[PDB]
Amino acid sequence: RANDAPIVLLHGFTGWGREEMFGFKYWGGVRGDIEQWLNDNGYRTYTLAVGPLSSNWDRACEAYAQLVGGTVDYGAAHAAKYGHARFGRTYPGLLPELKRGGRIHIIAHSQGGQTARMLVSLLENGSQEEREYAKAHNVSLSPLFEGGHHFVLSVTTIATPHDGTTLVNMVDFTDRFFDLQKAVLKAAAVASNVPYTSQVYDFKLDQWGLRRQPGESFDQYFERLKRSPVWTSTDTARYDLSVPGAEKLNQWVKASPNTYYLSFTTERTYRGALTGNYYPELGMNAFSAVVCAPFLGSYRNATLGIDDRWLENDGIVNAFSMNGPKRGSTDRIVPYDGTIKKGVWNDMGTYNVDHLEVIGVDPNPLFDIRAFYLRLAEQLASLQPHHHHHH
């Protein structure tokens, strides 16, 4: 054990806190409690809960406050640009040890990988636009926009759309994306057509002033959100998920030299000989197989620059986008050679598991989910702080 840094878990465009969904864990799902497994095995682990539909920016600012403590500061420039609130939620802070000198391992799934990368980028370099807007308007500035923070020892991404996902290119993506949200609710044994008085799934849309109202089901609430700024704006997950939006993110969110990066690619498809398309394997979650996989595995776009390397997928995200950011990115990606390197993406390999199977939300008995994360946890613990040249 070369380091003692705690592990922090980060969801994507779906995800909730440990107390949400009647205890049903995002990290573990039907398989159990991943955070508990790691803690029980001697790996200190925590779980972050941010806005699933929110932008990676807004998610980064939420994560920062959720880590060190305080009220979420979205930045005056950003808030003015997108028309949402500058200040959001207040958090007690999961790890006050960060401000006294500590580090963390961030393990991220799906869109979470974008959020971790951005969080690292803002912590290290801040936002120049935020700093200049502050001096020019005489408004205050969050420390997150100053740079100089070294909170993150490593970032691991699992099934992450670093170059985006072609899923957003479906003609009925708006209806199907929220059908996916209802599918995840279903997996937690939560009905989507029921007006729960208890809030089960908090989307944390405080900055937009959006929330589920009394007498309103998730079906009705989703219909509102589609017409809401968290779906029709660019300050959204919807945009960051897209190939053009992800490329834009890559152009300013770069790999820190002081931080280790690991990527895990997922796949759950087979190649059709005559078409060259990719089709959902036996076992893939019912939703992705029926609705999403056929599009992901057959859709091509010359203009957008999508050829047949993008067709292999895990039901939600294209596998070609997973090893690390490439579209509009200067980051390097190397295949794992037994040694883990700093400031570069370590391609840990491709795993035959779908997008929801890998976090246990969808079942897969042939997949030892407990071993996967325990093996990952010891790898992060083995990470040397300092490195030094040798033959």
Do residues 374 and 384 lie in contact, with contact meaning Cβ atoms separated by under 8 Å?
no
Tokens 């403590």 — which residue?
69
* Cα 282 to Cα 149, 354, 364, distances in angstroms: 46, 11, 11
235 annotated as belonging to a binding site for a ligand? yes
Q: Which does 163 bind (CB under 5 to 8 A by kind): Zn ion, Ca ion, none?
A: none
Q: Which does 124 bind (CB under 5 to 8 A by kind): Ca ion, Zn ion, none?
A: none
Length of the chain as a residue count: 391
Site string for Ca ion, 93-122 (x = CB under 5 A): ------------------------------
Q: Which does 267 bind (CB under 5 to 8 A by kind): Zn ion, Ca ion, none?
A: none
**Residue closest to Zn ion, measured at CB:** 235
78 annotated as belonging to a binding site for a ligand? yes
The DSSP result for 5-52, as a single string, is: PPEEEE--SS---TTSGGG--TTTTTS--HHHHHHHTT--EEEE---S
Q: How many CB atoms are closer than 10 A to CB 85? A: 12
Query: Is 110 in the active site?
Result: yes
Query: Is 142 in the active site?
Result: no
Q: CB of residue 294 vs Ca ion: minimum separation in angstroms?
A: 17
Q: How far apart are CA 165 and CA 197, in angstroms?
A: 35
Under rule CB under 5 A, residue 364 binds Ca ion: yes
Point out the catalytic residue in the list 33, 163, 314, 347: 314
Q: CB of residue 168 vs Zn ion: minimum separation in angstroms?
A: 19
Distance of CA 162 to the CA centre of its chain: 10
Q: Which does 235 bind (CB under 5 to 8 A by kind): Zn ion, Ca ion, none?
A: Zn ion
Q: Which does 283 bind (CB under 5 to 8 A by kind): Zn ion, Ca ion, none?
A: Ca ion
Do residues 111 and 12 lie in contact, with contact meaning Cβ atoms separated by under 8 Å?
yes
Q: How far apart are CA 310 and CA 317, in angstroms?
A: 9
Do residues 342 and 3 lie in contact, with contact meaning Cβ atoms separated by under 8 Å?
no
Q: CB of residue 55 vs Zn ion: minimum separation in angstroms?
A: 5
Q: Which is nearer to Zn ion, 231 or 320 (CB)?
A: 231
Q: CB of residue 290 vs Ca ion: minimum separation in angstroms?
A: 13
Tokens 């497994």 — which residue?
37
Under rule CB under 5 A, residue 235 binds Zn ion: yes
Point out the catalytic residue in the list 54, 55, 110, 192: 110
Q: How far apart are CA 181 and CA 362, in angstroms?
A: 13
Considering only residues 93, 283, 294, 343, which one is a binding residue for Ca ion as defined by CB under 5 A?
283
Tokens matching residue 55: 């932008």
From the list 355, 14, 316, 18, the residue with the least C-alpha distance to 185 is 14
Q: CB of residue 189 vs Ca ion: minimum separation in angstroms?
A: 17
The partner residues of 73 in beta bridges, in order of sequence, read 87
Query: Is 154 in the active site?
Result: no
Q: Which is nearer to Zn ion, 82 or 287 (CB)?
A: 82
Please give the radius of gyration of the chain, using alpha carbons only, rounded to the nearest integer.
20
Chain breaks in the chain (C to N over 2.5 A) after: none
Q: Which is nearer to Zn ion, 58 or 347 (CB)?
A: 58
Residues 22-81 close enough to bind Zn ion by CB under 5 A? 55, 58
Q: CB of residue 236 vs Zn ion: minimum separation in angstroms?
A: 8
- First vs last C-alpha separation in the chain: 24
58 annotated as belonging to a binding site for a ligand? yes
Q: Which is nearer to Ca ion, 246 or 358 (CB)?
A: 358
Considering only residues 362, 367, 369, 380, which one is a binding residue for Ca ion as defined by CB under 5 A?
362
Tokens matching residue 279: 């089709």
Q: Which residues are annotated as a binding site for Ca(2+)?
A: 283, 357, 362-363
Q: What residues are designated binding site for Zn(2+)?
A: 58, 78, 84, 235
Rule CB under 5 A: which residues touch Ca ion?
Answer: 283, 357, 362, 364
Applying CB under 5 A, which residues contact Zn ion? 55, 58, 82, 235
Known binding residues are 58, 78, 84, 235, 283, 357, 362-363
Catalytic residues: 110, 314, 355
